[PDB]
Backbone:
């Protein structure tokens, strides 16, 4: 009964079953050990600050198909990666099953510079949208990309594939068919001081590089015309041109 | 109390009072003899086909500040201009005061190649938006530019200024703050077979060439960010890139 997608969750994910929670809907990849995509719905009631971070193995998944807290041991030192959230903590921590935002199925090893730079900045702006009087929902779908070998976590013997990039597709209110939207894509190697506005892309580009079909419940003509046109939602997030 | 603008009718028009009808809201220019701007609101109930065209002097204006049917005598043969509508007839002909769509305050001498070409095609696409299930309203503001001498109507002695171009700013549903929008500007000499998609511009360009402020009731920050960014609404009208 929880729709975190509004216009159809993505198709093309490796699992045929997705986990549905108030915090988000997620489709896990048992080979890479990271979710293929995470869809969430921010509203005036979902943000919450100051919640703690108790990393934990997702109890809804088989332990062999996801990572455990022990698997990240030595990762920051070896790879300079942080435990980065797919669905953001602060934007959604007000929901009833908020601890699930810290389940490792909702985390990936994200380079600190990206995590603490452009990515955090986009999270801040995405959350601020909900403060606008006429904006009542923010629907986001986010996920990783796997384009080049990024190495391996040193503290685990599990087969996993560290993402080389991350993307986020966002629209407000009801549907991209009538409402402003945006898509961003950042490579793991994005410098710490990078301006997130420099990474606007089309949804089509994301689809082609991930094998997914986002906003899959939209009429074909709407999908055809809007997926190849960068949106204007970033202009409300402080970007120009 | 008929609101044909939704987010504030334009400021900057030469008249301090505008005519408000069900068909449209119009601000007249007693010097040029043509309206500075015409704002209208298309809904599923406003289109009507097959209405006739009985040109008439607008009874709400002083006859010296507008044109009369006799004024267009010989205009087509002399200047190859048609009596072009600002607020479109077929998209709004179902309203109660529809005859006002044929009042000359809603008409200007528009080159027939533009009138019967790109301008008519944009009117068709604009009206077609209302057929989409999720589009409940189309709010449009349209008007002329006066940038070069276009000559004079041969059948009149009244001082008047023929437009050199025409523009149209459109948004759907509620407000451009959250919904798709578009802006187009066409020179009087646009060729007959021109694709209207080539004439997309920003709202800022129009404001700068007219002296008006469109969507004048929007928060300043919304106005600053969206008016200089071309909208994506044309993509739903058949345009690419």
Residues:
């Amino acid at each position: 009964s929880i729709d975190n997608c509004a216009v159809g969750c993505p198709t093309g994910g490796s699992s045929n079953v997705s986990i549905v929670r108030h915090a988000y809907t997620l489709n896990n990849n048992s080979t890479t050990k990271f979710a293929n995509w995470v869809a969430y719905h921010i509203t005036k009631d979902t943000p919450a600050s100051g919640k703690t971070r108790n990393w934990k193995t997702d109890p809804a998944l088989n332990p062999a198909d996801t990572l455990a807290p022990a698997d990240y041991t030595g990762a920051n030192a070896a790879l300079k990666v942080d435990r980065g959230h797919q669905a953001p903590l602060a934007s959604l921590a007000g929901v009833s099953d908020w601890e699930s935002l810290n389940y490792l199925s909702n985390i990936t090893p994200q380079k600190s510079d990206l995590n603490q730079g452009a990515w955090a900045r986009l999270e801040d702006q995405e959350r601020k949208l909900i403060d606008r009087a006429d904006i009542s929902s923010v629907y986001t779908v986010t996920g990783p990309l796997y384009e080049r070998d990024m190495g391996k976590l040193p503290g685990t013997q599990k087969a996993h594939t560290i993402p080389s990039a991350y993307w986020k597709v966002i629209f407000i209110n009801n549907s991209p068919a009538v409402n402003h939207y945006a898509a961003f894509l950042f490579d793991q190697n994005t410098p710490k001081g990078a301006d997130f506005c420099q990474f606007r892309v089309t949804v089509d580009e994301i689809e082609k590089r991930t094998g997914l079909i986002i906003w899959a419940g939209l009429p074909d003509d709407v999908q055809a015309s809007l997926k190849s046109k960068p949106g204007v939602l970033p202009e409300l997030m402080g970007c120009k041109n």
